[PDB]
Design a protein around this ligand. Structure first.
Ligand SMILES: [Mg+2]
Ligand SMILES: [Mg+2]
Ligand SMILES: [Mg+2]
Ligand SMILES: [Mg+2]
Ligand SMILES: [Mg+2]
Ligand SMILES: [Mg+2]
Lengths: 178, 79, 114
RNA sequence: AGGGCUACACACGUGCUACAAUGGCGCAUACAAAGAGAAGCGACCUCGCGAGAGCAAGCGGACCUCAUAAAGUGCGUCGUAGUCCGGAUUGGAGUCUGCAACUCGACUCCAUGAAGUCGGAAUCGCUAGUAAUCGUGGAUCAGAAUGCCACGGUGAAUACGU
RNA sequence: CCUCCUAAAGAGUAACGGAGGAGCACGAAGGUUGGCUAAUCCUGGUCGGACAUCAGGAGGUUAGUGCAAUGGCAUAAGCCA
């Protein structure tokens, strides 16, 4: 809950004196991390899926949720089932704890990071930004690992507006860029 | 484009490009001194660089300096 | 050890092996041993901790791996998005070093396109 | 004056360099011939990683210079791997030539290190200091040689027979 | 043999009238208990692009229904165990 507490004390008030929230029950809290990693393919190897899963079950102590195809029809094959990826959201504890190993060690274990987007937001206040590639963070033998990975993470905050979304996140050691 | 120590350009441009500086940015500089080097004062200026048949325009940009004025004007016609 | 580009060029010789670093070669590899105080006949694998430690440390200076294979495109890219004979050559896949395109260019451009 | 004869999706001839261990690489190190040169060869030493620059001797030559030949021999290293093979390509930056190095010079430095694991049908030269292989000089020429002409080192196999 | 129109708002009703299907399929695609809810679009996100999965919003039976058509379906028959 490292960031968790930091939020209550440090944060909150910052927003309270910023947007002037009349009630503590208004300060944009952290609404679960998402994670996805759409390994897609599958139809070809079917093993790169479990790899992605395990790769996800790594950064996240919880078991990955192998998703399924929906429309089936597409510019390719894909049918009713047709597994594609594994979301696996985060929950408070494991969430912030993850939100910790992230930005504090994940983003830090860069690739050439020199400024994070400030428009990765949707429009309601929630954010989303795919690392474009698994930063090889605390994985099973960083060197003895599977061929790349890459995944997408969606902030998703109880922010009533993207603007407030900027205050939050950044309210913490969130990298970002100007 | 080696030349040891001593960037060189035909007298023409040297006197034309410098004049353009004061006179101000206007019509290009009709010249064949393509074998010359691009200078910073040339930036933002126009120069009619001949290739074979007729001359051609040039947009002297920042990075486009240490290079030869000629390398920015194809001569041959392929397909 | 990862050394730099994560590469594990071991079970050989400090020099020849270290050359595995996308950014170093016969010269840089045999020279880094100087500031790193390392021999040549030394097997990178057998290398004691500090031995490899110094390596990574000294190589941390000269640009290597990613940044190189990466930035190396910046320069080429420039000419390309610049409009000079240099870049112009790359897009057409033709020899930039001014070679004979009439014949012998299998390396620069594609092999056979009959 | 600028450019083109250096263009390219191609095909054919002549060549050069590899595909490695009869080798690569390091260090040490033995032997040659023929030549060249006042708008030329250019030492010596100072510096530069090096190309090369500074100073400046000597020679118009069995005196000087080009100019510490290579293979090789001793040892060491590598261990048959696309590999310490092989070097194309390209990037960054330099040396010199010359008004002039974009088009289109030669070379140096660092990095990059492809194809290629001996090549179908078919085809070429060579009968002895030859083949094979290893270095060296010159004409042209400001500067662009794997080409042409020439020099020597090492050094075979085979030829019943028409 | 099944569906719709012709069929004049009960049933029914003809033509060598206008249209389309059946001669099956499922030991689960049946039974029950418990739970779930589409399509499509906009916004934002590794590779994901017209459209693969993820997040949010609009939307509301426009989805789906084993196979024609009609009628029905959220208390869902629709979907999962
Ligand atoms: Mg010709
Ligand atoms: Mg001469
Ligand atoms: Mg000569
Ligand atoms: Mg009726
Ligand atoms: Mg009636
Ligand atoms: Mg979209």
């Amino acid at each position: 809950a490292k960031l968790h507490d930091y939020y209550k004390d440090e944060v909150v008030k910052k927003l309270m004196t910023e947007f002037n929230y009349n009630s503590v029950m208004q300060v944009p809290r952290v609404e679960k991390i998402t994670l996805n990693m759409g390994v897609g393919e599958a139809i070809a190897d079917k093993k790169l899926l479990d790899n992605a899963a395990a790769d996800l079950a790594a950064i996240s102590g919880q078991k990955p949720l192998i998703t399924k195809a929906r429309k089936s029809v597409a510019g390719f094959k894909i049918r009713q089932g047709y597994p594609i990826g594994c979301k696996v959201t985060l929950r408070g504890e494991r969430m912030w704890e993850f939100f910790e190993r992230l930005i504090t060690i994940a983003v830090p274990r860069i690739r050439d990071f020199r400024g994070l987007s400030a428009k990765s937001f949707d429009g309601r206040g929630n954010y989303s930004m795919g690392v474009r590639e698994q930063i090889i963070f605390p994985e099973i033998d960083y060197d003895k690992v599977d061929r790349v990975r890459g995944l997408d993470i969606t902030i998703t905050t109880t922010a009533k507006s993207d603007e407030e979304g900027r205050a939050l996140l950044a309210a913490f050691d969130f990298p970002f860029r100007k | 484009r080696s030349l040891k120590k001593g960037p060189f350009i035909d007298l023409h441009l040297l006197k034309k490009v410098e004049k353009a500086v004061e006179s101000g940015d206007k019509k290009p500089l009709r010249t064949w001194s393509r074998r010359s080097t691009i200078f910073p004062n040339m930036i933002g200026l126009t120069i009619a660089v001949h290739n074979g048949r007729q001359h051609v325009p040039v947009f002297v940009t920042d990075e486009m300096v240490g290079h030869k004025l000629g390398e920015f004007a194809p001569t041959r016609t392929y397909r | 050890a990862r050394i730099a580009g994560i590469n594990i060029p071991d079970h050989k010789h400090a020099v020849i092996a270290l050359t595995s670093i996308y950014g170093v070669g016969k010269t840089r590899s045999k020279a880094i041993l100087a500031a790193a105080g390392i021999a040549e006949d030394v097997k990178i694998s057998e290398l004691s901790e500090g031995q490899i430690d110094t390596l990574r440390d000294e190589v941390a200076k000269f640009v290597v791996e990613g940044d190189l294979r990466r930035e190396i495109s910046m320069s080429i890219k420039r000419l390309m998005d610049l409009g000079c004979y240099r870049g112009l050559r790359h897009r057409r896949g033709l020899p930039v070093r001014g070679q004979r395109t009439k014949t012998n260019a299998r390396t620069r451009k594609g092999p056979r396109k009959p």
